[PDB]
């Protein structure tokens, strides 16, 4: 049974948390709900590196800027629903970079209530799946080629 | 310019494992672990914390890579490696591990941030593909 001793170092501080977020390989954004729209108030470097948009053209603009795919229209809709209800959700989407090139990404959204200011914020995690998708497709082709 | 609770939630929601470690003598001691790291390795936070990084069983095929990591850590340098590791239950996973040094002169010591991304599916798909060409 777990009678484990509770552990965590109280040496950890907000400076180290910011470095974890800066070092994260996945993109990490924070968003707020202003009326009917979703506004990005924080983005980490990975988000820039994956999407090609800078922090400053993104910040405090509606997230509609990241161009979606029509094959994802249903998933897009599931996301807005969960956002309105403050429920979490996860979806794999084909999105478009600033230069219009496509990337596949798994997007996972967690709502969080802030203790200092009582308002509801949502945390996105943006995982590039492009390489997994591309490998799975090559394998599918080779199955047609070989077998 | 961002709340300290919100950063923690960012780290907690992460899919990748995120740890902090500090050098202690000959050891690199893990002082923080996020939930994804618990799930990736199969160990709970309280069984991981304050143990040397070698608690997580490695592969003999990685001995060279581990040596590079030791060197980078001793020198306070970042490094990145793909390793085969084994969970608490003994199942294997491939993971890309990226280490970022951070100096706190406040603490008079260098902290290390690992990012541990499970690459297992990428590795096995790549291996299947290698066969299909034979
Ligand atoms: Cl739409
Ligand atoms: Cl494509």
Numbering used by the authors:
A (entry chain B): -9 to 137
B (entry chain A): 1 to 134
Copy text verbatim from the article accompanying this structure deposition:
In the current study, we report the first apo-state crystal structure of the short LOV protein W619_1 from Pseudomonas putida. Crystallization setups were performed with both 10% and 50% FMN-loaded protein, where both protein preparations yielded tetragonal crystals within a week that were colorless, indicating absence of chromophore. The final structure contains two molecules forming a dimer per asymmetric unit. In the corresponding electron density maps, no density could be assigned to the flavin chromophores FMN or RF. Each monomer comprises a LOV core domain (aa 17–118) that shows a typical α/β PAS fold, and two helical elements at the N- (aa 1–13) and the C-terminus (aa 120–133 in chain A/120–136 in chain B). Interestingly, the W619_1-LOV dimer interface is similar to that observed in the dark state structure of PpSB1-LOV. The apo-state W619_1-LOV structure displays significant conformational differences compared to its FMN-containing homolog PpSB1-LOV around the chromophore pocket as illustrated by the superposition of the two structures. Most significant changes are seen in the Eα helix, and the Eα-Fα loop region (residues 52–65), with root-mean-square distance (rmsd) values of 2.65 Å for the Cα atoms of the respective Eα-Fα loops. The photoactive C53 shows a different rotamer conformation, with the Sγ atom facing away from the chromophore pocket. In the W619_1-LOV apo-state, the residues involved in hydrogen bond interactions with the chromophore in PpSB1-LOV point away from the pocket or form intramolecular interactions, as seen for the key residues Q116, N95 and N85.
